[PDB]
């Protein structure tokens with residue numbers, strides 16, 4: 019509660035913005051000139067604020083659009099069917115009650131398609147609008163006055179919501195993706211260092227977050243394409259997809275780290291005294307990889323191009339040194355006596371897996387640099403100082 | 404569309420059941436004795452069917468419970484505050500418009516807690532009920548008639564929804580979890596066989612589904628605890644958690660399978676001519692593991708206890724034979740000349756990783772059998788024939 023508000027102050031301004039919009043609409047409802055029709059249909063404006071106010075501007079824009087589509091299509095269809103119902107003079111209510119079944123069936127069958135799982139809020143508004151207009155106009159045969167009035171109030175509630183959301187400390191969806199990429203770049207480095215230290219001792223959250231947030235990075239990219247130019251990102255078409263490409267290149271590397279963490283939990287493990295022979299090349303490889311990942315993160319955050327010096331030189335030097343050390347001492351990995359128990363053979367052969375995995379991680383590091391260069395070229399990044 | 408309906412007929416009965424419930428409520432609204440108050444508040448019953456009809460009975464019960472709690476708490480609070488408002492005779496509307504701000508702030512701050520992410524439908528109904536009751540009773544000063552009437556029509560809509568859902572081909576939430584476990588047991592076997600065949604050639608969906616559905620298996624377990632006894636699962640407290648325990652034991656193996664798939668995508672690979680020397684042992688291990696996983700799946704599906712014969716004898720024997728074959732030919736994994744290029748050394752050392760991973764998979768297979776025995780003991784499984 020209070021501890022969470024003090025930890026993050028971005029969650030105490032959104033609630034007060036919603037309270038302010040609600041108080042404004044309420045003041046306009048209480049302090050208005052009395053009239054017969056408004057009196058009974060005036061609560062339709064304070065209930066739209068509670069249904070259209072979202073955390074970011076892009077979603078607010080993207081979802082309000084779908085809801086409006088659902089509403090206008092349902093209203094037009096309902097009005098057309100209500101007009102057509104007259105022809106069957108003898109059985110008006112039979113046809114009207116036979117149209118609800120066919121529309122509920124079609125609207126429930128079209129929302130179970132696997133590609134429409136994220137759009138159920140647009141099918142619910144369609145069913146609600148269709149039913150309400152048919153069941154609310156049967157008495158007094160008024161179908162063009164029960165919609166034109168009840169739509170202006172919804173428009174006014176959505177206008178107040180959008181104005182308050184957009185002009186009082188806006189929160190943007192491209193600034194949560196630019197930040198998420200930088201956070202993942204540091205989590206992967208922390209996980210790698212923790213894994214190498216845990217293995218050499220006499221790690222989970224980082225790679226789990228960097229391997230499981232692809233959907234967050236696709237929703238934020240589907241919300242950031244609706245927002246107008248602002249701040250440092252001033253261009254009509256911003257290359258938002260290159261951030262997803264860089265994130266995918268980093269997750270491909272993070273799989274190796276997940277496998278190195280799995281190696282620590284394996285039932286079959288190697289004698290520590292044998293691990294302490296290669297104790298000096300794994301920590302150097304880890305330190306160099308973590309430093310490289312943190313330098314890439316820092317460059318991405320400050321939006322600067324890569325300088326001339328090749329950042330992969332020291333890591334490749336440390337990996338070649340690892341390879342040489344493994345080559346000199348390969349007599350500890352196998353047993354030449356049997357050349358032509360099994361638990362001790364597997365325990366011995368378990369160290370080579372860890373070394374080969376570290377080596378593969380290094381061999382993969384290059385794709386992330388290539389993706390970063392592509393991103394820094396598509397978007398005009400500042401020249402390094 | 405039609406192809407999906409023909410593929411799965413369970414989605415064509417749910418739609419017709421929602422059409423039947425909607426048509427029943429519509430007929431009961433069209434054909435009733437006219438009265439002043441009902442005429443304007445009678446559409447409140449056809450709109451509850453569209454908001455309370457869910458795929459399973461369990462969820463239907465859980466979500467309706469949480470929605471009723473939100474509605475009743477919001478209504479009681481609104482009525483109490485409306486009563487208290489009188490004291491401030493001079494400024495009634497000021498106090499009423501100043502309570503909306505506070506309630507909106509608290510209801511928006513309590514829904515942003517990380518533990519309440521799955522309950523936003525219960526906070527939206529609370530805010531809507533409070534606002535509607537406060538703003539719809541200011542005129543005429545009627546606060547005990549705007550709720551008692553508008554609640555019996557919601558009770559009638561929910562009663563019709565529950566009767567039609569529960570008595571016309573019900574869909575239960577424990578029969579989708581019992582089926583999901585059996586499907587995962589076969590996907591893991593298919594993935595293992597595909598990976599072992601792909602490596603020796605001159606795999607993804609299975610383990611991805613078996614490693615990413617923990618949330619589906621926890622929501623289905625949070626919906627199955629509300630359902631009454633029925634069919635084969637007849638007991639007051641069914642051991643639904645032992646299915647999740649078995650699923651976790653299988654996912655622990657599926658991690659190793661993911662690592663064996665990762666080995667195929669590695670940049671550094673071994674000459675095929677060297678792999679061909681060990682093909683037979685790897686294929687025997689794969690065949691035996693897949694047969695064991697399919698026998699466990701088949702036993703789980705038919706609810707039968709494990710027989711006397713030990714299922715792991717063959718796999719352990721194929722693994723000891725693998726170990727012996729690796730021991731006889733370890734001179735192909737390293738290079739004794741350098742005892743005291745790096746790409747060829749790494750390519751050579753990459754085969755031992757694959758062999759050690761297969762061995763670890765086998766070493767882990769035991770925990771799944773232990774979990775299965777525990778599950779078959781907690782629930783009364785039939786004696787094997």
Ligand SMILES: CCCCCCCCCCCCCCCCCC(=O)OC[C@H](COP(=O)(O)O)OC(=O)CCCCCCCCCCCCCCCCC
Pocket residue numbers: 058059062065066069070082083085086089143172173176443444446447448450451454455467468470471474528557558561
């Ligand atoms: C008993 C045990 C079971 C418990 C059951 C729990 C029940 C929980 C459910 C609670 C109530 C369920 C619904 C009740 C029936 C619905 C009718 C009702 O509540 O009356 C309210 C309301 C009152 O109508 P009146 O009293 O007849 O005047 O009727 C409505 O349904 C209209 C509400 C409209 C406000 C919704 C916001 C509009 C959305 C449009 C979005 C379009 C996009 C925005 C614009 C885009 C840019 C242009």
Ligand SMILES: CCCCCCCCCCCCCCCCCC(=O)OC[C@H](COP(=O)(O)O)OC(=O)CCCCCCCCCCCCCCCCC
Pocket residue numbers: 065069089090092093094097143146147148150151164165166168169450474475476478479482528531532535536549550551553554
């Ligand atoms: C102490 C005792 C305590 C008693 C506790 C019970 C208290 C009394 C219970 C009643 C109080 C509950 C009040 C609110 C209940 C929550 C439900 C709610 O408020 O709303 C639900 C709901 C709105 O919120 P939603 O559920 O989120 O969608 O109501 C609706 O169905 C409205 C949906 C909007 C569409 C309706 C059709 C209007 C279309 C008009 C515009 C059409 C334009 C067409 C253009 C044609 C030309 C092209």
